[PDB]
Amino acid sequence: IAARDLICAQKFNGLTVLPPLLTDEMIAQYTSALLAGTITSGWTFGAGA
Amino acid sequence: QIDRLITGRLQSLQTYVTQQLIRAAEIRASANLAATKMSECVLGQSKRVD
Amino acid sequence: SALGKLQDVVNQNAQALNTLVKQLSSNFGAISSVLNDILSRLDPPEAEVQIDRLITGRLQSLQTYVTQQLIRAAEIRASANLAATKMSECVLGQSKRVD
Amino acid sequence: QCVNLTTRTLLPPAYTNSFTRGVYYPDKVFRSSVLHSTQDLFLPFFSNVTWFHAIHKRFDNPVLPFNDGVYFASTEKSNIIRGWIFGTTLDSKTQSLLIVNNATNVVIKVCEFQFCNDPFLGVYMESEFRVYSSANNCTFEYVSQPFLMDNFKNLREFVFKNIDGYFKIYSKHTPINLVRDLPQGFSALEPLVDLPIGINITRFQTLLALHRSWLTPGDSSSGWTAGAAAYYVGYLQPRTFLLKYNENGTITDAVDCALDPLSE
Amino acid sequence: DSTECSNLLLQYGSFCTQLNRALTGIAVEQDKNTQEVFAQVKQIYKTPP
Amino acid sequence: DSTECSNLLLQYGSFCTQLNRALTGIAVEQDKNTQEVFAQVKQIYKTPP
Amino acid sequence: TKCTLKSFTVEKGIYQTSNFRVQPTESIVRFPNITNLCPFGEVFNATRFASVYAWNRKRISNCVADYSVLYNSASFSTFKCYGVSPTKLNDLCFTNVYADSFVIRGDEVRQIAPGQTGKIADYNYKLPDDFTGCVIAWNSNNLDSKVGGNYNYLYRLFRKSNLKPFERDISTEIYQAGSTPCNGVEGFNCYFPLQSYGFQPTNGVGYQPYRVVVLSFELLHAPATVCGPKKSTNLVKNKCVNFNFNGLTGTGVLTESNKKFLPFQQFGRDIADTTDAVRDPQTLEILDITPCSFGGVSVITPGTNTSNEVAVLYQDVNCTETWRVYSTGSNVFQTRAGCLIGAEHVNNSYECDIPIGAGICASYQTSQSIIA
Amino acid sequence: TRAGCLIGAEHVNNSYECDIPIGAGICASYQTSQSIIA
Amino acid sequence: LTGTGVLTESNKKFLPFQQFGRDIADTTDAVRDPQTLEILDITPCSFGGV
Amino acid sequence: DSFVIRGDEVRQIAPGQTGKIADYNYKLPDDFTGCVIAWNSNNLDSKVG
Ligand SMILES: *[C@@H]1O[C@H](CO)[C@@H](O[C@@H]2O[C@H](CO)[C@@H](O)[C@H](O)[C@H]2NC(C)=O)[C@H](O)[C@H]1NC(C)=O
Ligand SMILES: CCCCCCCCCCCCCCCCCC(=O)O
Ligand SMILES: *[C@@H]1O[C@H](CO)[C@@H](O)[C@H](O)[C@H]1NC(C)=O
Ligand SMILES: *[C@@H]1O[C@H](CO)[C@@H](O)[C@H](O)[C@H]1NC(C)=O
Ligand SMILES: *[C@@H]1O[C@H](CO)[C@@H](O)[C@H](O)[C@H]1NC(C)=O
Ligand SMILES: *[C@@H]1O[C@H](CO)[C@@H](O)[C@H](O)[C@H]1NC(C)=O
Ligand SMILES: *[C@@H]1O[C@H](CO)[C@@H](O)[C@H](O)[C@H]1NC(C)=O
Ligand SMILES: *[C@@H]1O[C@H](CO)[C@@H](O)[C@H](O)[C@H]1NC(C)=O
Ligand SMILES: *[C@@H]1O[C@H](CO)[C@@H](O)[C@H](O)[C@H]1NC(C)=O
Ligand SMILES: *[C@@H]1O[C@H](CO)[C@@H](O)[C@H](O)[C@H]1NC(C)=O
Ligand SMILES: *[C@@H]1O[C@H](CO)[C@@H](O)[C@H](O)[C@H]1NC(C)=O
Ligand SMILES: *[C@@H]1O[C@H](CO)[C@@H](O)[C@H](O)[C@H]1NC(C)=O
Ligand SMILES: *[C@@H]1O[C@H](CO)[C@@H](O)[C@H](O)[C@H]1NC(C)=O
Ligand SMILES: *[C@@H]1O[C@H](CO)[C@@H](O)[C@H](O)[C@H]1NC(C)=O
């Protein structure tokens, strides 16, 4: 399956892809927080409370 | 022969690293623009045009 | 560590120079990396190949250092342009831009 | 000539860890205030080394392998260990190396020896020289100052290698007061000689002297006693070491890259 | 998986260390970019029911 | 400090000239950056006593 | 600068030239004071050589190696030096010299080299692939041959495995070439490993005997007890020179050092691979080698379509303190960047026309002249 | 972890700011007989 | 043909004139056992970041 | 360039060699472009006695 799969070939030859520090769900959580802030409060949450 | 191959593969790796550095600079520019856009358009109202 | 960016810049430059100095201990596929053992042991024609190997390797090292310096200079130029924009818009004026 | 010291006192072999030992100057070059990475036959850090005893009635001088190298360390107080024997079969069929020590001198020979099973030397106090029953086709001879010189106070560490055709020996003497096992710490072995014996080595044995003073019966496996003595044997492997150097030029520290991911 | 080539590469020199330094810097920069873009607010705001 | 290596390098070619061109450009760029950031005002204003 | 730009015209500005060079004046040599000559006769001009299967190894030390003495005596059909050029043998000192001597037939001389195969290389005498030394051979039919045959020279013909480099196998045991074991007795499919060369004056060049001498040594990296015929000179310090310490050429300044070298250490190295220290064989004192070239040099010039006079900025020079300058001038100005020569200090302050350094800018003004 | 198996660190159900960015959403630290936590 | 790797049965079918097999790179990813005339898959043993 | 020598000394006729011939009689430059030719002449340049 190595010659077939490209990732296996990249990985038998020393090349690895590291995982990001932020998951997609956590980024979505950040975005949802931003949307909730800009909806309920407007531009105030970006200046403080 | 092994030295020839080592030199060639080291050159290949260095080329890949340099290209990655340049692409990372481009991506960093894009990310800084995206952060500026979040701050100025999402967290506020922007009078800047376009 | 309030000023981490500036210290990292200085450390990067110093580390690059030190790496360039230490890459003179590389044999680059030759019999040595001293260039005096080669000349003492070998006659010119037989030393030409070793000296060419070392020249090629050290030229590659210098080119790599120069390329890294160019990229870091581009980053620093971006930072400096941002700093000039900040001086002009925040110091010499009042900015309505957020954050 | 052959006194079989077949005293039957079975004890299991005891194993110990070598914290940081066996480091030797790979080259005869001076370096100061620099970290140098070199690959050579080194004793891996925290390696499982064998422990042999000569206390009473226990005598330990078996034949051991010489796979790629040996780190021989002896905590002694009486110069009971007088040298070693190296070879493949330790018989007249093949050449063998003998290193032994008279007071204030050394004897080295590469000459076909029909080594005497349970070889040894004696103390009354010159006494006995029952190590080999024959010496034929004798090619190499060499004499120099004692390799071993003066509870368990002095730690004589030796490293033996058989590169291409040169037998390289690195030695150091460190005074201590520990009496149980190796002293955790650091010490570098400086080169001693490079003997061009040009032979094949796969096995080796140690030569311990015996004490027969208060009474002397028929000198069979009886009427003999060995003072407290032990030696540690460690086998070197190709390893990459990071060596520290101080201003004076001594090593004073090192790292085994392949020991664990942290050291790598 | 070759001992001879590796022992030769040790002589050829340590350029791979600086290659890896560059790649690690790139990866950390990517994480920093994600943090700068999305992690502009530490208070996580929930949308009202 | 080797005449032989230098006379060989003359043959190998002139890449060091362009290396130095790049480095000089970098240095001039640094000076320009400093001027652009700080030298935004030519009139030097003194704080009143 | 004009050569660097590959042009005859330099536009106004400041340019970086080569670092300050100082060319050496003297050329010293320091070899150990040895008067004895190497045992060339005993190694090359000795009867009763050894057999290849029991090649003799002789140590050589404390002798000058002037091989010119061999020109009148003997001529060598083969002379190959690995790891060193023959021309440089007269300008080198050798650490651990060993002379390996033996006798073989002409066809087998080729086998005396790294990477070869055959009965000699595989069973009698093998050289390492990373071999530093020289191989010498010459016909000895007039010496090692007799009417009716000379069978005193033997060679190993059968062995269980190929030999390792610089390994000697004098064992005389019956070789077992078959499954049937033979114990100390010759028999069918069992052979005596040793065989005798049949040397006669009549036979051909191929089967004619050849006396082979192999010299193995290390160059540099350690004290050199053997040296060439080159003559030593007096010691010079605090001056750029072209030195030669035990065959190690170079160029630099030599000064006393606080470094302490162990007896087995001769040279010293730095973070790079570069001899930063050395021990004088004759005086047994440590010396510090320092490169003579040091300091940046920058040239301040107008367009050269306006004026041909220039000013030179010497970085890493403090004139306020025989300065390290190419040429001194009447106008000397000291700056935090370095000493500036060819420009006169003016107490006035203008906009920067030529950015010399810290806070110094040059220009062309006024009998015009350069100002800083 | 989604990055891979982590050995030498003990999982804690609490959530702190990232001291050591292991991977996907995992960060390590030195705390408490001190020990490494994930 | 020396090397280092794991050997496993393969579904590859080799023509009579074919002995070795290669991948996108120049690397023997397959081989035919002369004694048993069966195909084998060579896989590097080193794999996984640490 | 023509001359006569003994067979043992033919090897000395090449750049980088050493010996009585190369050092004292006939030396070739290291950067030598050309060809070297030799052949036995015992039947011609030899005499009884
Ligand atoms: C050095 O000696 C060892 C034996 O002491 C040789 O290895 C043996 O080789 C024979 C066949 O030649 C085998 O039957 C043995 O099993 C081997 N023993 C071991 C322990 O490996 C070795 O070949 C010799 N070295 C050389 C270069 O001849
Ligand atoms: C006899 C022991 C001398 C050892 C000295 C160290 C080795 C130095 C190199 C000497 C090589 C001499 C080879 C003969 C030189 C060529 C003579 C010839 O071509 O006629
Ligand atoms: C006992 O000693 C004799 C000495 O002649 C020797 O031949 C024999 O091998 C020895 N046996 C043992 C078991 O040591
Ligand atoms: C050394 O090996 C023995 C047997 O293999 C083992 O019991 C012992 O634990 C090892 N040493 C250490 C320190 O564990
Ligand atoms: C004692 O030492 C001398 C030289 O110091 C040596 O010649 C002699 O062989 C030694 N005696 C023994 C029994 O080894
Ligand atoms: C070794 O010694 C024995 C006994 O004298 C002799 O028969 C044999 O020929 C010798 N081997 C040599 C000199 O190689
Ligand atoms: C270095 O050598 C000096 C003597 O020259 C000595 O005083 C000093 O203690 C040495 N350094 C160390 C770390 O031992
Ligand atoms: C040594 O050389 C001389 C002439 O150079 C020669 O007469 C003599 O026979 C040689 N010695 C031997 C042992 O052949
Ligand atoms: C010869 O060299 C030694 C050191 O090896 C030195 O002690 C001695 O003074 C020197 N003699 C002369 C005359 O140079
Ligand atoms: C530059 O050179 C041209 C050609 O000689 C000349 O005509 C012109 O006057 C020069 N410019 C200056 C400023 O001297
Ligand atoms: C130059 O040296 C003088 C002493 O001769 C000293 O006072 C001055 O500070 C030095 N200047 C620089 C830039 O080093
Ligand atoms: C310029 O300043 C120097 C001191 O820096 C002084 O010696 C000199 O007299 C001044 N000249 C003028 C014209 O002001
Ligand atoms: C932590 O969570 C695990 C399940 O993920 C659970 O088994 C364990 O009991 C919890 N411990 C505490 C202290 O909450
Ligand atoms: C010999 O090899 C052939 C394939 O070439 C195979 O069919 C046969 O079984 C083998 N015989 C033995 C005894 O291994």
Residue numbers in the entry:
A (entry chain B): 844 to 892
B (entry chain B): 992 to 1041
C (entry chain A): 943 to 1041
D (entry chain A): 14 to 69, 77 to 144, 153 to 178, 185 to 298
E (entry chain B), F (entry chain A): 745 to 793
G (entry chain C): 299 to 619, 632 to 676, 689 to 694
H (entry chain A): 645 to 676, 689 to 694
I (entry chain A): 546 to 595
What do the authors report?
The SARS-CoV-2 viral envelope is decorated with glycosylated Spike, a large (>1200 residues per protomer) trimeric type I fusion protein. The first is to attach to receptor(s), with ACE2 identified as having high affinity for one domain of Spike, termed the receptor binding domain (RBD), and many neutralising antibodies function by abrogating this interaction. The second function is to act as the machine which fuses the viral and host cell membranes allowing the viral genome to enter the cell. This multistage process is not fully understood but it is thought that receptor attachment destabilizes the prefusion state and cleavage of Spike by host protease into two major fragments, S1 and S2, releases the metastable protein to undergo massive conformational changes, discarding the S1 portion which includes the RBD.
Here, we report a high-resolution cryo-EM structure for the 2P version of SARS-CoV-Spike ectodomain, revealing a tightly packed arrangement of the Spike trimer with all RBDs down. The comparison shows that for the ‘locked’ form, the NTDs are rotated by approximately 7° and slide inwards towards the RBDs by ~ 7-10 Å. RBD packing around the 3-fold axis also leads to the ordering of a segment of S2 (T827-F855) where Y837 interacts with the main chain of the adjacent protomer residues P589’ and R634’ (’ denotes neighbouring protomer) and the side chains L841 and F855 form a hydrophobic patch with residues V551’, T553’ and F592’. Careful inspection of the ‘locked’ structure revealed the presence of elongated continuous density extending deep inside the hydrophobic core of the RBD ([Fig fig1] and [Fig fig2]). The density occupies a curved pocket lodged between the ß-sheet and outer α-helices of some 589 Å^3^ volume ([Fig fig2]) not found in the previously reported ‘all-down’ and ‘one-up’ structures. The length of the density is consistent with an 18-carbon fatty acid such as stearic acid, and its curvature suggests an omega-3 or omega-6 fatty acid with at least two unsaturated carbons ([Fig fig1]). In the absence of a formal chemical analysis of the molecule we have modelled it as stearic acid, however note, by analogy with enterovirus pocket factors, that there might be a mixture of lipids. The fatty acid fits almost entirely within the pocket (85% of the surface area buried) and is stabilized by a series of hydrophobic interactions ([Fig fig2]), whilst the polar/charged headgroup is exposed at the end of the pocket where it faces a neighbouring RBD, interacting with R408’ and indirectly with Q409’ ([Fig fig2]). In addition, the first or second glycosidic rings of the N165 and N234 glycans make polar interactions underneath the tip of the RBD, opposite to the ACE2 binding site: GlcNacN_165_ with Y351’ and GlcNac_N234_ with R457’ and S459’ ([Fig fig1]).
